[PDB]
Design a binder for this molecule. Structure first.
Ligand SMILES: CCCCCCCCCCCCCC(=O)SCCNC(=O)CCNC(=O)[C@@H](O)C(C)(C)COP(=O)(O)OP(=O)(O)OC[C@H]1O[C@@H](n2cnc3c(N)ncnc32)[C@H](O)[C@@H]1OP(=O)(O)O
Length: 422
């Protein structure tokens, strides 16, 4: 499908199979002065609204809307379980504005029925510094589906961001839209097999007993990497530089500021185990040097119609970095690769141990970054979904997603996608 995109055919996006030769903005430059200060027209019975994350009730309508409508099928037996903690983390990064957390409420009932948010970030695209925004959490109520409300949400958010002189954005989607700059596959590492099976999230291959599977996926109780501990504010300067250094190898990344970095990796203090969102770890050597860093975040699902379970823990491998190959000049030097693979397999194995001990039931990871070096060895099984990466108002050459043409993990090129979207 290439011409049947009534809305996207009108937007400044790359075209399918387009041979990019000059990367960069698509539309001719504009000024925030050429941008209407008035919110786009909306269906007579609807009205725009600005969700204040700092408001209990308002933030609540957001995750209630998303929880009830994020899954496409009432018979699924499961639902997303966004929390106030999750959104406080994801929506309050430095530079955020209530004006960019947009919703659509029914005038009469004031019911939230749509939502979409943007957060400002600096994107690094093949070395190019691009002030942008990341769009996420787009959601339209099930009763308002196939009515083409989405394009209006997109256009209204594009306007508010443009009025602030920001002209680009990164967004991801499982569905195929005009020219993705990259595609990655999802993988799942069973941490609590028995429960995943009982809530029907994994199968039992013919020839295998439930005992085979449990033993096969059984994990040690304690981590193994020496010097491994939780990230602390004291560590920020070192970890930040280590991260930036490692990240520079990728072609698509978010260029954090120390402030953004700290907000993103050290969560809200005083949160119970069962409510904690971000989990960041570091490895410190006897000389005080920080040589490793990895993180994962929690986003549970609510389980339905089950007498034994009503919640499913889901950990998502996030950002990480290590100096394991800083000794070699060329990332793809087979020696640099071997050294990096051995370290990542070690660090991420401990990550699975930490996620399981944190009561995560399954561990999710994409084939982005250098993930394919450890994915198969650490038993992250091939998932059924794929994630396409896109750039609004920006034309860029294709970036490796860590997949072979047959959808298997490309362990030799890995991926040049360094950003991890929520
Ligand atoms: C510089 C500043 C710019 C900032 C803006 C950046 C732009 C990018 C922002 C995009 C945010 C993405 C980041 C995330 O949050 S991706 C996560 C989105 N959420 C979910 O997948 C879970 C729940 N799903 C829903 O609520 C769906 O029903 C949605 C709302 C997604 C579609 O509701 P609906 O089924 O009732 O469709 P429609 O009748 O309103 O309208 C259909 C039109 O919209 C296009 N469409 C559908 N889904 C997506 C999607 N995920 N990205 C981009 N476009 C999408 C579609 O191709 C069609 O246009 P066209 O093919 O005919 O031309």
């Amino acid at each position: 499908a290439m011409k049947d995109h009534k809305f996207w055919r009108t937007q400044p996006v790359k075209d399918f199979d387009e041979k990019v030769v000059e990367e960069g903005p698509i539309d001719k430059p504009k000024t925030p002065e050429d941008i209407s200060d008035k919110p786009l027209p909306l269906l007579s019975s609807f009205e725009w609204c600005s969700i204040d994350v700092d408001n209990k009730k308002q933030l609540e309508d957001v995750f209630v809307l998303l929880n009830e409508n994020y899954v496409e099928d009432r018979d699924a037996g499961f639902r997303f379980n966004y929390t106030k903690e999750f959104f406080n983390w994801a929506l309050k990064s430095p530079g955020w504005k209530k004006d960019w957390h947009i919703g659509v409420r029914v005038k009469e009932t004031q019911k939230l029925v749509a939502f979409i948010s943007a957060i400002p970030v600096t994107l690094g695209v093949r070395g190019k510094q691009v002030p942008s925004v990341e769009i996420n959490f787009l959601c339209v109520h099930k009763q308002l589906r196939s009515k083409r409300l989405t394009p209006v949400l997109i256009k209204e958010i594009t306007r508010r961001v443009n009025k602030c002189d920001i002209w680009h954005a990164l967004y991801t989607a499982g569905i195929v839209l005009p020219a993705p700059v990259s595609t990655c596959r999802y993988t799942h590492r069973p941490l609590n097999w028995k429960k995943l099976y009982e809530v029907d999230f994994t199968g039992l291959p013919d020839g295998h007993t439930e005992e085979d599977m449990i033993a096969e996926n059984a994990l040690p109780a304690k981590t193994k990497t020496a010097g491994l501990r939780k990230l602390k504010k004291e560590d920020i300067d070192q970890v930040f530089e280590l991260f930036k250094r490692y990240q520079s190898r990728f072609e698509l990344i978010q260029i954090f500021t120390k402030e953004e970095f700290e907000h993103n990796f050290i969560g809200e203090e005083s949160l119970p185990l069962d409510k904690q969102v971000i989990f960041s770890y570091v490895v410190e050597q006897p000389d005080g040097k920080i040589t490793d860093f990895f993180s994962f975040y929690s986003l549970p699902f609510t389980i339905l119609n089950n007498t034994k379970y009503k919640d499913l823990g889901i950990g998502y491998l996030y950002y990480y970095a290590t100096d394991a190959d800083f000794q070699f000049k060329d990332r793809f030097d087979p020696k640099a690769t071997k050294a990096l693979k051995t370290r990542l397999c070690e660090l991420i194995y401990d990550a699975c141990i930490l996620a399981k001990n944190a009561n995560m039931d399954v561990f999710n990871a994409l084939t982005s970054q250098d993930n394919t070096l450890f994915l198969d060895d650490l038993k992250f099984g091939p998932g059924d979904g794929f994630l396409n990466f896109y750039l609004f108002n920006y034309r860029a050459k294709p970036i490796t997603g860590g997949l072979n043409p047959d959808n298997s993990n490309d362990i030799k090129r890995r991926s040049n996608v360094g950003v991890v979207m929520l």
